[PDB]
Amino acid sequence: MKDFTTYLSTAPVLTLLSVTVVAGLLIEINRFFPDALIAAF
Amino acid sequence: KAGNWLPGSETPAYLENLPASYGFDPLGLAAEPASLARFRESEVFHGRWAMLGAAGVLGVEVLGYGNWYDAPLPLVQGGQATYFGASVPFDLGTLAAIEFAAMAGAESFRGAAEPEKRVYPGGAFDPMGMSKGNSKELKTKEIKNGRLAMLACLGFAAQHAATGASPLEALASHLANPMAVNFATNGVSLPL
């Protein structure tokens, strides 16, 4: 699975998974914390 | 030298043999010899003018003739200025003309001389000759008193720009309650 994990470590797979997890994290942030116009603490 | 301003630091090498040298040039403004020279005459001249100015500011308050701020006010919107409460017959334009002529003459004769004589000219400027007997320490006194007087004049200007009182009345107000009248209490210095 060394070659398979090397394929998973290739630049397109890693950038698509990274933008996927970042977009999903931001989406769930807006799902639980919607309409956050300002950083009101 | 006698001094270090930052005791735990190394001072610039070009500030060692000069009088009143504490090695204070953290910005490196006088790394060149000509600039260091020009700064030296500028420092001594500013110190002398500031000593005269601070002496005048203190003396007009202690003799009771207003502060340093309302002194030119009688000459404006009317005329008839006062010195020691007396009378002078000169208005603003001719006073500026006479002062410009006198200062032009004095500073054109001073600035056309030797560089050492542009800051330390003996003879008629030392009538009793007390510069003899090692003038290094007395020069250190002169530049230090000048530095204190420049600080004092800047303080007069800034305090009047912030609080609007006279320097001696500001001093008395500070002595009234140093807890709650200092520079942190007005709305100007600290933006709170």
Binding site: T5, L14, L37, I38 | -
Partner: protein, 165 residues
């Protein structure tokens, strides 16, 4: 009132905008039965809109001529009037997070530059090394300031290519 602006808690046009949005959503409501899935979706949308407007009125935003929140992008003008969360606090947040990402990428570049094949390591990313450097990049400001004071953050101009003028 920092620049002729009124708070949205007391500005009338903010309440008018909220009322108009809720009324439009109620006009959308008045077509389905009470317990249908579209009815629940519209009720959730209404609740979100009212919560958003009440939160904007609560947080102390400034409204202009009409009821739209305005942000202040001046330190001091936003600090002493309590609107540092408009621009200043998100400025600090972005600077921190962008520095984290950029420092992680930089350290990955300098880590794989001194390997056998730096060419291969940039299309075939060493995932454990990238994960470690992404974790280490959370202390990016202190590391960057330390490397700047050390002089190892920047490169001498005599070792950098330029054109022949």
């Amino acid at each position: 009132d920092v620049a002729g602006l009124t708070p949205c808690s007391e500005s009338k046009a903010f309440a008018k905008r909220k009322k108009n949005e809720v009324k439009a959503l109620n006009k959308r409501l008045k077509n389905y039965e009470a317990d249908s899935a579209p009815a629940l979706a519209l009720k959730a949308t209404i609740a979100r809109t009212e919560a958003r407007f009440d939160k904007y009125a609560k947080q102390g935003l400034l409204c202009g001529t009409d009821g739209l929140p305005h942000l202040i992008a001046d330190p001091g003008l936003a600090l002493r009037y309590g609107h540092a969360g408009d621009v200043f606090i998100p400025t600090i947040g972005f600077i921190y997070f962008a520095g984290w990402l950029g420092y992680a990428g930089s350290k990955y570049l300098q880590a794989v530059a001194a390997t056998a094949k730096p060419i291969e390591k940039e299309i075939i990313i060493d995932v454990p090394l990238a994960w470690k450097l992404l974790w280490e990049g959370f202390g990016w400001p202190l590391r960057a300031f330390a490397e700047y004071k050390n002089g190892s953050l920047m490169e001498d101009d005599a070792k950098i290519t330029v054109s022949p003028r």
